[PDB]
């Protein structure tokens, strides 16, 4: 394992889908809030939807 900061791992991950990595850094709080909220929807989905 090689450590790397998570916002730099996401720049590799964006560049791997052809989205240029400055599109992460210029939107990092939006991308974080969308991810955190999407994990939230999985808790509610799994809690409700037997």
């Amino acid at each position: 394992a090689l450590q790397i900061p998570f916002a730099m791992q996401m720049a590799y991950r964006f560049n791997g889908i052809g989205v240029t990595q400055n599109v992460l850094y210029e939107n990092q709080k939006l991308i974080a809030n969308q991810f955190n909220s999407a994990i939230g929807k999985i808790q509610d989905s799994l809690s409700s939807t037997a």
């Binding site: 730099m8 240029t20 210029e26 990092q28």
Partner: protein, 57 residues
């Protein structure tokens, strides 16, 4: 452009992800976008512009 910005503690280099090969940071190695106020954890350094000393000479 490809690879990562890295420092040995005193100097900043770009290098490719999977094999340490430090290169001077330049307008050929890097692309601009926006400005300093937008990005979390950006660092100050010079960027060498390889055209400039040729025009100066």
């Amino acid at each position: 452009r490809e690879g990562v910005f890295v420092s040995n503690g005193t100097h900043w280099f770009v290098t490719q992800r999977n094999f340490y090969e430090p290169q001077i940071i330049t307008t050929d190695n890097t692309f601009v976008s926006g400005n300093c106020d937008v990005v979390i954890g950006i660092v100050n350094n010079t960027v060498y512009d390889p055209l400039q000393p040729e025009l100066d000479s």
